[model samples]
Target: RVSHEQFRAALQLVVDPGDPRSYLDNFIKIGEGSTGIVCIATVRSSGKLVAVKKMDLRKQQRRELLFNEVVIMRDYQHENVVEMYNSYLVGDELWVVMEFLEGGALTDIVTHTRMNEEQIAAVCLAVLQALSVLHAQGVIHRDIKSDSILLTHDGRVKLSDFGFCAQVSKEVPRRKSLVGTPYWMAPELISRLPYGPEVDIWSLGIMVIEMVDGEPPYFNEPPLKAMKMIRDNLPPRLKNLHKVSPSLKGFLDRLLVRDPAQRATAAELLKHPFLAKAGPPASIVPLMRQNRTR
Candidate 1:
């Protein structure tokens, strides 16, 4: 029956069906989206903390978006990428169990404390490590803003929010639809040119600017105006050029190149001199602690 097939299509959303509550306990609601609430819970068997992002099974459009994130999270496994423990369809909602990041978004620290060059390098190093792996597998993270970068109390930086990711395969080698934060978007992407992983590099460059100056280049500009500025204007520059080291400036230069071919790949960026300035991962712990006390 038509109704039966629709039911089956809905069921497919739960890639790994289970009773989430049976394994997860002490659900403390942390945030809410339009469709459902996100909760921090504990694994009963292992006593580990996890974040449960629940989505209501309602509209067809919501299903596709939720499924995209679930599939990407399930497919990727990297130290610098958020780990998905499992997925379940409990009652009428889909619950995705993911690694619980106690320190919260890196944006919090950028807003609370101005990061030094060392801390910025550390963050970039971690992000590039993740991007290198994803790009090598032909996956482009269409969004790489500060809000999507998560930090752990132990100083681990991880990338989250894979809803906008696109897979480059033989059938679809590139993406051309407009996606990503306007201020951080690549010029080619803004101009509707086919793009790949290099778009993420441009976004990471904007994020670096955010870390240095406390905001992206066009933070004050209106959305439409910012997109025009990003597309037409010269590449963004660090406001306090005199204060930053040359290596840091060069690193941003490598990332913000207008041509995708010229933009350094994540693997190449990992070897840049700027990354040499990165202190140990433990350097981020102090900022994380500082934000919590305030």
Candidate 2:
């Protein structure tokens, strides 16, 4: 008999469980991590495809991290949030089976083409819609960047990677922590000041700039240098934003406000002219799919 608490000890030479896998085909290796490699698999009974993120729960702390992710997945099941189909613990390894999106990540899409104002708006609209839902739930997605947004073949956009998210309530809604990609971080974050949902809005604005410029401001700068620039300077906008519509620049300006108190919230940004003019989220799918590899 295997004790649940005692099972994660043999992480080095554990044998594969023969009757364990319910997936039809062998797991196709997709990515890797410090704990374990990720694999793609299809459910044998349902024929549904999924991305399985496997990890080594060698310590109780590791299992707690997995538990947090699973809790977030189940609690936040919106159309924009990636779905976790199932999860299980096998020996020292844990597997989280989630919905797979073949369209790849926004980082890849932007690498192919600099999004025009309209295209940028479409992306912003979808993300802001997701942010509204997330913020309302008292969750701040501290890591909002191009890499965090995943696309489906059908052109649907969903936010992924909640590893750095913070859960705060009405009574304790602000947190001070220096975490996030330097390029997309808010000034308040750099100042070590108490921050909240507005930090995500600032990061979202940076994401839009990335979509427009094919990179964030100071893309060529070193990380620490960029952090200093963000802290000391006024919010950066497209130097040639004159090339795009004023609404786009205005939107960024509002989100990139250095004062967190004045930064636009999801409710405020949803009504901005930039989002209003941005084509419907459906329009973004065709725009992105055109750049898809055959």
Candidate 3:
């Protein structure tokens, strides 16, 4: 809830980058993207710290495209979705303030230290629950890479990025657009064929390799052609599987099925023996912090 003072301040924001502090203060830049700039800032009056993602209202199409996330965020409420507090357009920039996750992004863990089968399964469980919640709402998160997954202070993980999310009116919710990162994209998506929520499942299977081996299967190939290989060739498997158990490999095999028809649903995957053996977020976050600092 906005306090009386914050309400007045929210109404008084101006565009002068020269004195953005007059609008807000205690600024520290955190991220920047196609939307605009991102920062961590404190509400001087409320003493609350928030993550602010900015967007340029100048590019009419990009602005609207990026705003899908804003609308989806405002419309939905789930423990697995990032929280949006308030957003305001000032001058040519749109400021989106949301929750600040002190535990940081999941990429840190995926890249810095190799995760155990249990830790990987735990991460998979968290995101599968997130996908289940989103698909139930007719939303598809086209981008579900490790970089877009974040961890809260409580050591829980959630999915982020809704710029490519689509609300399907079809009897079965499916997207046919070619969007999202090349490495993590599903074969059906690269083919521009109709794809449903299972695309995320395919990417999640790829993510397992990323967790165990530090990258997707085609780390060396050119981006566009790599996806062609995925579409025409064999699905990539974890090359160094001796380190992981067989049940984990079986889990990935089901998820990486080439035919979307054969892919497992989030709820079905939830019952897989893999998740029952996965570790909690609490057990994995420390390794991320230590590895990042190393």
Candidate 4:
């Protein structure tokens, strides 16, 4: 229930290194999610553009979690990670200003053009490279879904959204809470076992399968049932992806291993042959398209 005046007031408090007045009356809603709304705004002074994520403060828990994510992003700087320019509270809302990525989410692109092995490799390499840095700093990004990966105008992948990120230190014991997208959740996480960065690799495997198969491997029934399948049944084989390279398939097999201890580390995954050279091949037919003709 935020009023327009409150939204504007909140934007005013956001301290952007660039011109603040420049963003006076230029916000266009570009996306919406369960927790927040995303807007693209034009800065007047530099004529530069930025993305603004507005999260409702009515939900205290989500607000606090997003605030933590803002702090974490502010502390960490990396090419593959999304940049948070500024943040502030406005009335019953929290607004985060970030670098605007014109190319949009990898999930959207992959839906239109199925990724070849090389393409999948390139995306994975970028994501895992970011994870390597985060893990080195003892941060585990529990949520690693495709929607969280944004593509820049130049075709580079940037990992955004630190909502589920948690710090892990030698003194910190493994966490047992269940978090992250169901289809991509690791077997250990589905079972509510103490887990760490390995959960990200399991998600990476699911991403690979999605790139190849055009949908999640376990998208056979309801989500809870899918979690059960991931926990009780063996990892789904890439039988439908016969066209995928064996090396790529082998890499996925190792990544989605049921035992977190056995899954490939981000560092180990970087060295896999599938990611050794080149990008994914171009497709003859578009991977996705809507029939709006009717």
Candidate 5:
């Protein structure tokens, strides 16, 4: 459905001939990265709020590296994944329009609140659902930490950040790149071995510990030392072992397996008994709203 002609036609629909500012108003800066900035704005035609991630294409290597995110966001459509509305080239900067999520990143919740097993299960279910779709499509989201999960006010969870994503086609069935944050990265990724979708499961396992204890394993360790811990040491244990249920530990065991073949797939994890603890999405609303004064 996306082609050069369609791209040109979409650009023409912007309110002004060439300027995104004419089409979008009320910009509020929301995020910043090495190559881009994220802001919330209202579209003139629909008067709807949207998140715009803008990147300067003139920066060396940025265009080639970051455009992968634009393509993934524009093409993927899933309830548990953030939706992309459109994309435009405003001068040398690329502005990507996306659905606005008011509840903020999951990092907010993990940092501000100590989530119980039920809350942690709900978050895992939403993320696993999103991963089921992406893995089925042969896409690996290299970054699956809490920071990449966004939420709606009503508690709906959506996965974001495709900057480190990699595609596995028939010709290329696995990925070997060293990507993602150190603490959450899968062991295979650090070993530079070819890997598949199960890497995301490993990161999600770390996120579970983060949700419960407020940080990932080796949070205080140096980056190289942490990476070594992940590669050589046994999978980190949750704090207050008595507080974590056997079912939750079982789930993490499946996810943090050193051997990718032994790790559970998204679908398998979705069916695990621990996920039955997940309540309605609305159950997370209070936690999501508690710390927001802005």
Candidate 6:
């Protein structure tokens, strides 16, 4: 683990490098972190724009976890995954320069527009495609929620945030770590059973349900209580089933099955009947933006 002073020196190196006149500025704070903050910064030399995530070493957990995240993201390259351009340590801070996505998260889009079934399917398809690639490489995205799914200006969907991703192997059990949003967690994970990529599929099901229902399936109670419901209670009912086709509901039922063994695989979900149909009608009315605070 890097010490606080060491991390700060590393950040200064990133900002100044070898040039005595090199300086960093134009930092626009966009998000906050337990350790530091996320901001948009401009490189003086080439006038390049990048998202700079500065992590403070004062918080050991955030410092270590985010440092690992930066390392992993730097080596990962996918069209649908956020890209990490470069990283350096300056003073006592660690700075990560990454691709700047223009539009906000899919969670934001869903909160505002309340996507119809077809639109929801479109988004799911994009996410599944990305997941398929990750799973193929033995990478498990432990936290697969709406907030991690991003939208580009042209409406392309990409998955962002790698704070909880882990490499999976045949000998590794899924329950090795309890991570991710409680409402979107799979029953097997909640029950502390060994899990794998199937957990991501389960969360995707919950996400799809949210898209259609306009809220998480288990938001009626406290989070711990919701986790209990996930483990013991029947899966939440689709309250707005009439608005969508029965085939779509059937698809959700299969994907959201409490039994991890029965959950749909990414390949199977891609071929489901619901995806075969033209997506839900596009609404001219825009969605509302709601602030999500932890």
Off by over 4 Å in 4: 1-22, 60-63, 280-294
Question: Which regions in candidate 5 have their CA more than 4 angstroms from the true location?
Answer: 1-18, 58-63, 290-294
Please give the CA lDDT of all the candidate structures.
0.83, 0.76, 0.76, 0.75, 0.83, 0.71
lDDT of 3 at 222: 90
Report the C-alpha lDDT of model 1 over 89-189, residue by residue, as the tens digit.
76667788898988788777887778999989999999899989889999888878888898887888989877677789988989777877788889999
Candidate 3 lDDT, tens digit per residue, 87-198? 6655656677788887787777877788777778888998888888777777777777887888877678877776767777668556566777788888889899988888
The ten-residue window of minimal lDDT in model 4 covers 283-292
* Model 2 lDDT tens row, 49-138: 788877767544334444455667777888878898776656566777789887767886777766667767877888888889888888
Query: How high a TM-score does candidate 4 get?
Result: 0.86
lDDT for each residue of candidate 4 in 1-294, tens digit (9 for 90 to 100): 766565455445433434333464588998875568887887676778888787876664443365455767777888888998777555556677789986677677656565666667878888988999888788888888778888765667789878777778888857887778899889998998889889999988888777777678778789999999989999877756678777877888888899888888988888888887446322211332331122
Q: Select the stronger candidate by TM-score from 1 and 6.
A: 1
Each model's TM-score?
0.89, 0.84, 0.87, 0.86, 0.89, 0.82
Better of 1 and 3 by lDDT: 1
RMSD (Cα, Å) of candidate 1?
A: 2.7
Global lDDT of model 5: 0.83
Query: Candidate 1, after superposition: displacement of residue 264 in Å?
Result: 1.8
